[PDB]
Amino acid sequence: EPYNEWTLELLEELKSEAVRH
């Protein structure tokens, strides 16, 4: 489950955007 840390941290950038808007 190496991708899990890649996608999770990847969405962390989407949450900031959602949190940004």
Curated annotation (Swiss-Prot):
Modification after translation: Phosphorylated on several residues by host. These phosphorylations regulate VPR activity for the nuclear import of the HIV-1 pre-integration complex.
Chain ranges passing through the membrane: none
Subcellular location(s) of the protein: Virion; Host nucleus; Host extracellular space
Function: During virus replication, may deplete host UNG protein, and incude G2-M cell cycle arrest. Acts by targeting specific host proteins for degradation by the 26S proteasome, through association with the cellular CUL4A-DDB1 E3 ligase complex by direct interaction with host VPRPB/DCAF-1. Cell cycle arrest reportedly occurs within hours of infection and is not blocked by antiviral agents, suggesting that it is initiated by the VPR carried into the virion. Additionally, VPR induces apoptosis in a cell cycle dependent manner suggesting that these two effects are mechanistically linked.
Comment field (misc): HIV-1 lineages are divided in three main groups, M (for Major), O (for Outlier), and N (for New, or Non-M, Non-O). The vast majority of strains found worldwide belong to the group M. Group O seems to be endemic to and largely confined to Cameroon and neighboring countries in West Central Africa, where these viruses represent a small minority of HIV-1 strains. The group N is represented by a limited number of isolates from Cameroonian persons. The group M is further subdivided in 9 clades or subtypes (A to D, F to H, J and K).
Family: Belongs to the HIV-1 VPR protein family.
Subunit-level organization: Homooligomer, may form homodimer. Interacts with p6-gag region of the Pr55 Gag precursor protein through a (Leu-X-X)4 motif near the C-terminus of the P6gag protein. Interacts with host UNG. May interact with host RAD23A/HHR23A. Interacts with host VPRBP/DCAF1, leading to hijack the CUL4A-RBX1-DDB1-DCAF1/VPRBP complex, mediating ubiquitination of host proteins such as TERT and ZGPAT and arrest of the cell cycle in G2 phase.
Protein name, entry field: Protein Vpr
Organism expressing this protein natively: Human immunodeficiency virus type 1 group M subtype B (isolate RF/HAT3) (HIV-1)
